[PDB]
RNA sequence: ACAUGAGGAUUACCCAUGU
RNA sequence: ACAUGAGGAUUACCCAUGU
RNA sequence: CAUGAGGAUUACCCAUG
RNA sequence: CAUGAGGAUUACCCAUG
């Protein structure tokens, strides 16, 4: 098939959608970025390795930029005022079936589903209590 | 909000759902676990501190049991053969507003949304190709 | 050509066939695996580099699971008791033409063709006698 | 029975066939070569050893020569312009049944069957993509 | 999705066309090679790195071989009488948007377009007069 | 007769076209510059020298400016926010006939032709994936 | 001597790292 | 080089403890 | 690492900070 | 002078023989 396809990272109902696409697979790290200047793009990187003698380890990273225009030396340039970084590590024992793995995925989706504790607190600049 | 409540981690339409509930709150770290022996349960923990002068950081963790051939309630060794571990670290600059944070959440949701590349690879014991 | 596609590794006439599909392409190394837990799957990887000034070299690897008494999806230890490993290294002088290479392939096919000495010994837990 | 028999290494439909035969078993290494001068012959060598305290290891080697006539010192001699070398190592756990081993063999045949990705790329001076 | 596909390097109508196909992609260096004798193949390599804080830098390379037969000692081999070497480096600020790049490319295509000074002088064994 | 004429560097239909014209030719280095503010002009340079006994070597260079206004102290000047830099070197044996060269050029044009891997990756702020 | 290498070769040899 | 950290970051990098 | 109308056996070598 | 998937203020600088 090829899973290296572009996808929608931030869905705002067809319009305003942040869509990210394959930009590089050099060095075994898969990369997707938005269509901006390199300095303002959104970035998503992913890679897997057979870490332990019996584990596999996914290393995923996402960069969310706060686009802004900065005046440097009398000239204006496109840039990010700051970035938000998400980095995650997932270790799955080699004994895990596809059925087993799908479970992991569904669980991760449930973790961030609108309404649940965590994404709630996050988007409210709050902790859990 | 007042978010430390029970929720659905794995949703199978109601029948077969995996629900995780508040199990501990020592040190400010919120913990949720499913109704199993701790050796086989689903666990979720989360906390927020200010990593540095400019950023705050969420540290979210999830543990997912291997189920295929699992023996409910039994002693399954080695432990690293029956468990998967997720470790997330979300860094957010003190300048992010509640809206900013909401987008960051959506970005995460999209990353793992069903059908998109990342979960696809994971759920198929695959990398990017 | 445009060859990184799924194919049949073990053919049992259609019924019982073992199919292996593209599972990863990091670093240029193509990987194919069967639909199993990685601990029990069939794996195939392949790559080509120029070993030296005069030759190129293919490095092909295959992993075949032990099935007799196998427990589908379960945790089978020790790993070296349940897996077989094939490692091939094909060195070809830069002077070999496409025809030259075709013969080299046929030579390989014949080496393992059903009925010939080598596979006969292997498939019978035997040496040459 | 005795598996140490001659076989056809390169099949071109009865005519033009490269046929190889038993030439030496000295030192525990089985050898087959074509009917040429020693300098232009095709060679196939095979051997097995009880490597690990629980593995068996087949070590197979094949030499495909590019026959040519070289004029050395005003005199012509039969020789190989260059050779193509195939070397493979197969490790099978002692617990493997004959049924298990046959599987390994069938898998190796499938790997090189005309049409499949690998032999395809090889005979086209190409990599997999 | 991959941009590591094979393509036409030299276009001579429909036939007489030089085609180059993926060979290897180790160390973040993509490589393409035309078919048949590697000794006479065409070669193309490409890569990108963050040269500095502000710029990214591409390094492209192309080899054009002069096909010939080399007879020595009465032994002939397919070789390259010689090779023409192209090597280029393109540096682009991180402020370059997806548009800024398309423009940079047009400039490159225009530089070599038929009739224009440079490609003309080259193909005429000439300099600028 | 002169090949030191002005030409179209960037082709945007009939209007929006970037034109470059002879500026200077000192030291055997031909130079072209687009019109208006030199500070925002496009630049192309070219030259050839006998690199060795067997080869001649071309050195081509192109500058693509990002036009912008720089206000400083309330004084604005037409400037280049930044520039994209292209520099290439082509080496060709003295045995290359007028044909051998035309081929080398086609290879160059093909390398950058629309749709092909390299020009694509560049214009997409991407590498090879 | 094993083990490991998308390590090399004049191809039943050699190299490097590990024990 | 792994392992571990509710360790840090300019974010495919660094730090500390462990072997 | 960065520049060279610096050479090549073409992802290497050299001068120079 | 020659190599570098070596940087740039882009016919310059640097490492390396």
Swiss-Prot record, chains A, B, C, D, E, F:
Record's keyword annotation contains Ligase: no
Keywords for this protein: Capsid protein, RNA-binding, T=3 icosahedral capsid protein, Translation regulation, Virion
GO molecular function annotation: identical protein binding; RNA binding; structural molecule activity
Superkingdom per UniProt: Viruses
Localization annotation: Virion
Gene Ontology cellular-component annotations: T=3 icosahedral viral capsid
Region (Viral RNA-binding) residue spans: 31-104
Protein name (Swiss-Prot/TrEMBL): Capsid protein
Species of origin: Escherichia phage MS2
Lineage: Viruses, Riboviria, Orthornavirae, Lenarviricota, Leviviricetes
